[PDB]
Amino acid sequence: MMEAMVKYLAEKAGISEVEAAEIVLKAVKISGGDVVKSIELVDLFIEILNKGRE
């Protein structure tokens, strides 16, 4: 699960592997371990982490 999310976020947000792992762990913690909610939340993170620096 998470390994795909880590590289996916690193590519789509340009962040490093270690930062993506931290953000993905935050998402997994908040989601309660749900796979679907984690992916939704990582996509929302990809939105926020882009439009917030621009």
Site string for a second copy, 7-46 (x = CB under 8 A): xx--x-x-x-xx--xxxxxx-xxx-xxxxxx-xxx--xx-
* Residue of 18, 14, 3, 1 whose CA lies nearest to 45: 14
Using CA atoms, how far apart are residues 41 and 54, in angstroms rounded to an integer? Answer: 20
Listed in sequence order, the residues at least 6 apart from 11 whose beta carbon sits closer than 8 Å to its beta carbon are: none
Shortest Cβ 19–a second copy spacing (Å): 8
- Interface residues with a second copy (CB under 8 A) are 1-8, 11, 13, 15, 17-18, 21-26, 28-30, 32-37, 39-41, 44-45, 47-49, 52-53
